[PDB]
């Protein structure tokens, strides 16, 4: 229904993994992203176009492919919806 939820979910899964690896460049790199997609989601004046420029998930799908699929799957979908919203496109997936 809303992207805020999709990204909100991953935020919870990330916390768990982070606990095991307190100081991962890939974790923070992907986490910090979720913060942007969420910020812009509420912000109107802030930069939104960047949502399309960003590219989170390509690293998680490879690095966190088997090690942490719950995060990768959530990330790939997190930015996915973000891009559309960034421009104002409809959202709806199976």
SS3 labels along the chain:
CCHHHHHHHHHHHHHHHHHHCCCCHHHHHHHHHHHHHHHHHHCCCCCCCHHHHCCCCCCCCCCCCCCCHHHHHHHHHHHHHHHHHHHCCCCCCC
With CA atoms as reference, report the closest residue to 41 among 75, 74, 70, 81.
81
Q: Quick one: 23 exposed, middle or buried, by C-beta within 10 A (0-12, 13-18, 19+)? A: exposed
Identify whether the C-beta of residue 85 lies closer than 8 Å to the C-beta of residue 4: no
How many residues can be counted in the chain? 94
Task: Please tell me the number of Cα atoms within 13 Å of 54 on its side-chain side.
Answer: 27
Q: Give the start-to-end residue ranges of the domains of the chain.
A: 1-94
Q: Cβ distance 71 to 30 under 8 Å?
A: yes
Method: NMR
């Amino acid at each position: 229904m809303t992207p805020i939820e999709y990204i909100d979910r991953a935020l919870a899964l990330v916390v768990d993994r982070l606990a095991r690896y307190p100081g991962y460049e890939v974790l923070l790199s992907a986490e910090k992203q979720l913060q942007y997609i969420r910020s812009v989601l509420l912000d109107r004046s802030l930069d939104r176009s960047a949502l399309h420029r960003l590219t989170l998930g390509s690293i998680a799908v490879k690095e966190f492919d088997e090690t942490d699929p719950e995060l990768s799957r959530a990330l790939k979908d997190a930015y996915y919806v973000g891009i559309r919203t960034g421009r104002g496109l409809k959202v709806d997936l199976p």
